Enzyme design. Structure first.
Site, PDB file in Angstrom:
ATOM      1  CG  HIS A 457      -1.990   0.983   1.236  1.00 60.31           C
ATOM      2  ND1 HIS A 457      -3.023   0.927   0.330  1.00 60.31           N
ATOM      3  CD2 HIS A 457      -2.283   2.001   2.080  1.00 60.31           C
ATOM      4  CE1 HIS A 457      -3.907   1.861   0.619  1.00 60.31           C
ATOM      5  NE2 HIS A 457      -3.486   2.528   1.676  1.00 60.31           N
TER       6      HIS A 457
HETATM    7  C1  LIG Z   1       4.362   8.938   7.237  1.00 58.59           C
HETATM    8  C2  LIG Z   1       4.050   8.005   7.373  1.00 58.59           C
HETATM    9  C3  LIG Z   1       4.088   7.165   6.287  1.00 58.59           C
HETATM   10  C4  LIG Z   1       3.607   5.875   6.336  1.00 58.59           C
HETATM   11  N1  LIG Z   1       3.596   5.290   5.139  1.00 58.59           N
HETATM   12  C5  LIG Z   1       3.111   4.105   5.079  1.00 58.59           C
HETATM   13  C6  LIG Z   1       2.978   3.483   3.735  1.00 58.59           C
HETATM   14  O1  LIG Z   1       3.377   4.070   2.728  1.00 58.59           O
HETATM   15  N2  LIG Z   1       2.381   2.259   3.722  1.00 58.59           N
HETATM   16  C7  LIG Z   1       1.963   1.536   4.844  1.00 58.59           C
HETATM   17  O2  LIG Z   1       1.528   0.426   4.631  1.00 58.59           O
HETATM   18  N3  LIG Z   1       2.049   2.095   6.098  1.00 58.59           N
HETATM   19  C8  LIG Z   1       2.488   3.363   6.194  1.00 58.59           C
HETATM   20  N4  LIG Z   1       2.570   4.003   7.413  1.00 58.59           N
HETATM   21  C9  LIG Z   1       2.223   3.183   8.590  1.00 58.59           C
HETATM   22  C10 LIG Z   1       0.730   3.136   8.698  1.00 58.59           C
HETATM   23  O3  LIG Z   1       0.275   4.446   8.443  1.00 58.59           O
HETATM   24  C11 LIG Z   1       0.318   2.574  10.050  1.00 58.59           C
HETATM   25  O4  LIG Z   1       0.981   1.372  10.225  1.00 58.59           O
HETATM   26  C12 LIG Z   1      -1.041   2.021  10.129  1.00 58.59           C
HETATM   27  O5  LIG Z   1      -1.943   3.003   9.756  1.00 58.59           O
HETATM   28  C13 LIG Z   1      -1.386   1.495  11.529  1.00 58.59           C
HETATM   29  O6  LIG Z   1      -2.783   1.310  11.778  1.00 58.59           O
HETATM   30  P1  LIG Z   1      -3.423   1.132  13.211  1.00 58.59           P
HETATM   31  O7  LIG Z   1      -4.761   0.547  13.036  1.00 58.59           O
HETATM   32  O8  LIG Z   1      -2.522   0.484  14.183  1.00 58.59           O
HETATM   33  O9  LIG Z   1      -3.637   2.547  13.754  1.00 58.59           O
HETATM   34  P2  LIG Z   1      -3.760   3.961  13.174  1.00 58.59           P
HETATM   35  O10 LIG Z   1      -4.289   3.840  11.809  1.00 58.59           O
HETATM   36  O11 LIG Z   1      -2.474   4.674  13.382  1.00 58.59           O
HETATM   37  O12 LIG Z   1      -4.881   4.738  14.007  1.00 58.59           O
HETATM   38  C14 LIG Z   1      -4.972   4.871  15.411  1.00 58.59           C
HETATM   39  C15 LIG Z   1      -5.986   5.928  15.683  1.00 58.59           C
HETATM   40  O13 LIG Z   1      -6.446   5.969  17.019  1.00 58.59           O
HETATM   41  C16 LIG Z   1      -6.597   7.298  17.475  1.00 58.59           C
HETATM   42  N5  LIG Z   1      -6.248   7.187  18.892  1.00 58.59           N
HETATM   43  C17 LIG Z   1      -5.009   7.112  19.431  1.00 58.59           C
HETATM   44  N6  LIG Z   1      -4.959   7.296  20.715  1.00 58.59           N
HETATM   45  C18 LIG Z   1      -6.283   7.261  21.059  1.00 58.59           C
HETATM   46  C19 LIG Z   1      -6.854   7.263  22.304  1.00 58.59           C
HETATM   47  N7  LIG Z   1      -6.151   7.068  23.406  1.00 58.59           N
HETATM   48  N8  LIG Z   1      -8.166   7.393  22.283  1.00 58.59           N
HETATM   49  C20 LIG Z   1      -8.830   7.273  21.136  1.00 58.59           C
HETATM   50  N9  LIG Z   1      -8.376   7.066  19.920  1.00 58.59           N
HETATM   51  C21 LIG Z   1      -7.070   7.142  19.954  1.00 58.59           C
HETATM   52  C22 LIG Z   1      -5.541   8.004  16.669  1.00 58.59           C
HETATM   53  O14 LIG Z   1      -5.671   9.423  16.763  1.00 58.59           O
HETATM   54  C23 LIG Z   1      -5.663   7.323  15.303  1.00 58.59           C
HETATM   55  O15 LIG Z   1      -6.741   7.707  14.507  1.00 58.59           O
HETATM   56  C24 LIG Z   1       3.004   5.334   7.476  1.00 58.59           C
HETATM   57  C25 LIG Z   1       3.098   6.091   8.622  1.00 58.59           C
HETATM   58  C26 LIG Z   1       3.522   7.432   8.586  1.00 58.59           C
HETATM   59  C27 LIG Z   1       3.468   7.922   9.405  1.00 58.59           C
END
Ligand SMILES: Cc1cc2nc3c(=O)[nH]c(=O)nc-3n(C[C@H](O)[C@H](O)[C@H](O)COP(=O)(O)OP(=O)(O)OC[C@H]3O[C@@H](n4cnc5c(N)ncnc54)[C@H](O)[C@@H]3O)c2cc1C
Ligand SMILES: Cc1cc2nc3c(=O)[nH]c(=O)nc-3n(C[C@H](O)[C@H](O)[C@H](O)COP(=O)(O)OP(=O)(O)OC[C@H]3O[C@@H](n4cnc5c(N)ncnc54)[C@H](O)[C@@H]3O)c2cc1C
Lengths: 481, 481
Positions: A457
């Protein structure tokens, strides 16, 4: 006296020549018509792919693509005097000729630096079961300038453009002459329906003179005869979207040269039209032609030399590969055919080329990459087939401005066990994406272990691993079951 | 009272929420901090990938790429007043904000149109084994504005940027703030060695002010810690080739704001330098943070929540996925972790995510696509390993002018039976190419049925099926055997 005399220093020809000489230490004559690209015979050392084929068209398609890039560039903030922006055809074909010339020059050394490999400039003719003349012209009356005695002969003469028999066919060109145009045509008619025609419609479109206009015409119902039905309608849309006329069920009857150098093409379909250039791309046919096959008693099936799995003719010391076999007309299939011939005859193992599940690409804008069976055939081979279809306008293309640019990803499946039969995609990067999918298909991938792979992705490739549920079926007939 | 309360409407969070609600017909609360991208908390409905992650950076990398296209366009005949040609950063981030906002808007409907799914705006805190407060701020003193009683809790809080503890760290930014810059920095220092740092070095480079200058600095020996050794040196070359300073074995000790708004970064490595913007990209860390895990008695291994194969904590009705597990920090791994959790707990089958052989890409210019083991690890796991290496400057890039743009294709193999352990490529279209190779690796492809597939000519992908003979070995040590 030679072990092998290979008629045609082509893609398959030069491959078998090098593999015999170098790997099995044989003595090899390679004969080719000329030895640097361009008129009068257009092909030269390196074959059709290098001189008037793949290598130059992809440089030319790559150049034609830059007009998209300069356009949709503006949506991501990139600004410049677009009034100022013009395409320099002369520069394109100028750098092309350079690139192609060096492939030619390097093959020179290859011969000029290897035992066994030697090149005779001329036209190869079969005099017997195993003497072959390097004559001085196509005409077998022309002066013989060498007779090679040999123990084997490999016929790798390739294939030539096929011209219709039309009033004024004289005033039309081919793929070959298109690569050497002094300048880009204003009004063009590429006659034909698929691949070369539609690829060249792309190139002519980009380098045309702004009041120029491109008209692809096909005597079919839809261009790209033989490709997946969805890729055909979608490409037909996005081709016309970028402004190339696509005339279906229209065919040239008579090209008459009118006056100013203009050409009046009357279609048998009543219509008459005016063009500056008519290019015939109605077919290609085995260069069986001037090989004197009867002299050895070699058999044509139809068009070209008929040859078995191990690629040998009736005559027992003669074999044939590539395009003159009229098998799959693709460079890397011919290189494989070639590689496996010497491995068979100068080697221990036999070896035959798998002509199934070969991935390929049309370098239209946007391109097509495809592998395996199309819907309409698998439905005849298998009892229930599932078709997985995914079309979307990529986000980058909403914000680029080419919303018309849809990505189609189709996976057709033998539903009875899940073996992926064919994958087909249209869209930017289609050809690159399809290569991994060709390896998959020869591993006998199931649809399950497509959608079970974690995607990369954000890429358009990841779309293949996101297709779980079918879209409709063929239970002998098409059935959204 | 709910079946599941998912803390964080992320990539994995929103996936498990929808899969439970819709597929198993459960009642689901999803809580997220805010609900449209941008400051103060940057992440919102959709998680980090949508708001300050993949989706916006690939739009921004795609925009930064157009500077290559406008450059090498000239070699294929395309001319324009290149004096006139300037990049409009404001337009880029303007269309970005639009695109990201709609992903936000659509998730609104998704909740606003589905039974079971409901969204609470706030900060999720664990009060017990199964009550969770939607409080009004991070601070657990702040007003509770909801207590959700529930039978399950899913912790999907993701991960935040990691900042060093430095004199003047206040004057540095992150990935997050970089996406909202009013304008492009003239002098930039992206601190960090890999992925986000080098991806953003690309973007800043393209939209800089011509007398602007980009300096990637890493306290390592070579950028992209953890990637195949050849891809690292080659990318380091082509990054500097396009003019981005790469300072290795240099690390910020003290950012002091000097005067005009300038920042004087003294490196612990003696050196002092002047920049307009310092971006910290030294790491990311689980948002374990303000979850109140002790309240339920949930265990951190290190950094984030420790969780088994089936992704559940010590506390028996609490599970965790994605980045807070500190497993693989990738969107499509977290979506898989999520998908398999509900299939395990609200479903019949268990289901665990295969964290091995996951293909990924760095969107540097040019990009990297990679899958499987790097050389230096496989040599510790297998007795004899064969490394297949192919580097070449593509013809299109001789005639484009970026001769520095080498394509590296590497295939490392368990030589003892031929199973491909890892493929690694650097070059344009690397990420698209690698996707098919990920499916191959999970089919357990041998090197043989790589080179035994017929190539798609002319593509850079076909290079993988052209690598027959090894280049050197590791028979415990590296040995051109
Ligand atoms: C710049 C940058 C580039 C990246 N590029 C890539 C890429 O090209 N391809 C790829 O595959 N991955 C990429 N990633 C990694 C990817 O974005 C994350 O791995 C992935 O989105 C993780 O998903 P998740 O479900 O763990 O949580 P996330 O999608 O990070 O979401 C967690 C959410 O919970 C909310 N939250 C947090 N704390 C609390 C709380 N205590 N109370 C309520 N809600 C809360 C947050 O504000 C957020 O919306 C990138 C990351 C960054 C930063
Ligand atoms: C435009 C255009 C685009 C194409 N694009 C693609 C593409 O993108 N990808 C792809 O994979 N394939 C492509 N092809 C097909 C590909 O070029 C051919 O399939 C492939 O090169 C066939 O190789 P071959 O060994 O049979 O013979 P060739 O490579 O065609 O060579 C035969 C050679 O023999 C010489 N010769 C012929 N007659 C005699 C004679 N009697 N005496 C001596 N020598 C003789 C010829 O002059 C020529 O050099 C393209 C073809 C054309 C035309």
């Amino acid at each position: 006296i030679f072990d092998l005399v290979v008629i045609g220093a082509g893609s398959g020809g030069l491959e078998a020549a090098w593999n015999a000489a170098t790997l099995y230490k044989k003595r090899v004559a390679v004969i080719d018509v000329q030895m640097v690209h361009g008129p009068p015979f257009f092909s030269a050392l390196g074959g059709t792919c290098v001189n008037v084929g793949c290598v130059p068209k992809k440089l030319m398609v790559t150049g034609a693509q830059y007009m998209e890039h300069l356009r949709e560039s503006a949506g991501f903030g990139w600004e410049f005097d677009r009034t100022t922006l013009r395409a320099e055809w002369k520069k394109l074909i100028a750098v092309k000729d350079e690139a192609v010339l060096n492939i030619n020059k390097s093959y020179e050394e290859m011969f000029r630096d290897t035992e066994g490999l030697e090149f005779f400039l001329g036209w190869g003719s079969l005099e017997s079961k195993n003497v072959v003349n390097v004559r001085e012209s196509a005409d077998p009356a022309s002066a013989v300038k060498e007779r090679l005695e040999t123990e084997n002969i490999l016929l790798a003469s390739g294939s030539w453009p096929h011209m219709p028999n039309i009033p004024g066919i004289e005033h039309c060109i081919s793929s070959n002459e298109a690569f050497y145009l002094p300048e880009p045509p204003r009004r063009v008619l590429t006659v034909g329906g698929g691949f070369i025609s539609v690829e060249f419609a792309g190139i002519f479109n980009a380098y045309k003179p702004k009041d120029g206009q491109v008209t692809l015409c096909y005597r079919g119902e839809m261009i790209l005869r033989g490709f997946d039905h969805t890729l055909r309608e979608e490409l037909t849309k996005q081709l016309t979207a970028n402004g190339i006329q696509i005339l279906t069920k229209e065919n040239p009857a008579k090209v008459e040269l009118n006056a100013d150098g203009s050409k009046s093409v009357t279609f048998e379909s009543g219509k008459k039209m005016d063009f500056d250039l008519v290019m015939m791309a109605i077919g290609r046919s085995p260069r069986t032609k001037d090989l004197q096959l009867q002299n050895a008693g070699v058999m044509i099936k139809n068009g070209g030399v008929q040859v078995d799995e191990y690629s040998r003719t009736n005559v027992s010391n003669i074999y044939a590969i590539g395009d003159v076999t009229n098998r799959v007309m693709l460079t890397p299939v011919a290189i494989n055919e070639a590689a496996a011939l010497v491995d068979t005859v100068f080697g221990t193992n036999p070896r035959k080329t798998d002509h199934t599940r070969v991935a390929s690409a049309v370098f239209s804008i946007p391109p097509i990459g495809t592998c395996g069976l199309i819907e309409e055939v698998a439905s005849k081979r298998y009892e229930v087939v599932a078709v997985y279809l995914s079309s979307f306008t990529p986000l980058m293309h909403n914000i680029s401005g080419s919303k018309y640019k849809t990505f189609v990803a189709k996976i057709i499946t033998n539903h009875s066990d899940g073996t992926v039969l064919g994958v087909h995609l249209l869209g930017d990067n289609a050809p690159e994406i399809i290569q991994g999918v060709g390896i998959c298909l020869k591993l006998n991938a199931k649809i399950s272990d497509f959608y079970n792979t974690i995607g990369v992705h954000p890429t358009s490739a990841e779309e293949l691993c996101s297709m779980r549920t079918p879209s409709y079926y063929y239970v002998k007939g098409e059935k959204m079951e």
